[PDB]
C-alpha cells in the first residue's frame, strides 16, 4: 500500500501511498496531523517540506 | 554569476547566484525578491518552493 516512507529525525514517519495519499505518524506509530510549510529532516539528512499535500525535497 | 535558473510557467525566472543570494525576474527582466512559501511551476513541469532561503523541489 505504501510506495515510499520518510524516516524523520524525530522518530516520526511519513508514508506515501499508491493512491497518492500521504500519512504521518509519531515515534509511537500513532497517527498525526501533517505540518504544512515546515521543514522536516530524514534520518539520512534529507530535508523535506509539505505543501498542498505534496512533498518537496531540498534541491 | 548565475549558478542556477528555473524557468517558470508564468514567464518569470528564478536565479540562484554564485554567492548564495536568490532572486526572481519577471517577464520583463525586472529583478525581485524570491517569493517564500509559494509553489512555482517550471516550464519543464517541476514545481519548486522556497523556504528560509533554500529551494525545495517536488519529489
Ligand atoms: Cu506506519
Ligand atoms: Cu537573469
From Swiss-Prot, chains A, B:
Q: What induces it?
A: By Cu(2+). Maximally expressed 30 minutes after induction with 0.4 mM copper.
Question: What are the cysteine partners in each disulfide bond?
Answer: none
Listed GO MF terms = metal ion binding
Q: Which UniProt keywords apply?
A: Copper, Metal-binding, Periplasm, Plasmid, Signal
Gene Ontology terms, cellular component aspect? periplasmic space
Recorded superkingdom: Bacteria
Question: What are the subcellular locations of this protein?
Answer: Periplasm
Q: Answer whether the UniProt record assigns the keyword Protein biosynthesis to this protein.
A: no
Q: What does this protein do?
A: Involved in resistance to copper. Can bind up to 2 copper ions. Has higher affinity for Cu(+) than for Cu(2+).
Subunit description = Monomer in the copper-bound form. Homodimer as apoprotein. Dissociates into monomers upon copper binding.
Question: What name goes with this protein?
Answer: Copper resistance protein K
Q: Which organism is it from?
A: Cupriavidus metallidurans (strain ATCC 43123 / DSM 2839 / NBRC 102507 / CH34) (Ralstonia metallidurans)
Amino acid at each position: 500500500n505504501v510506495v515510499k516512507t520518510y524516516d524523520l529525525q524525530d522518530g516520526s514517519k511519513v508514508h506515501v501511498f499508491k493512491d497518492g495519499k500521504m500519512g504521518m505518524e509519531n515515534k509511537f506509530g500513532k497517527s498525526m496531523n501533517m505540518p504544512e510549510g515546515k521543514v522536516m529532516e530524514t534520518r539520512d539528512g534529507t530535508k523535506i517540506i509539505m505543501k498542498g499535500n505534496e512533498i518537496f525535497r531540498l534541491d
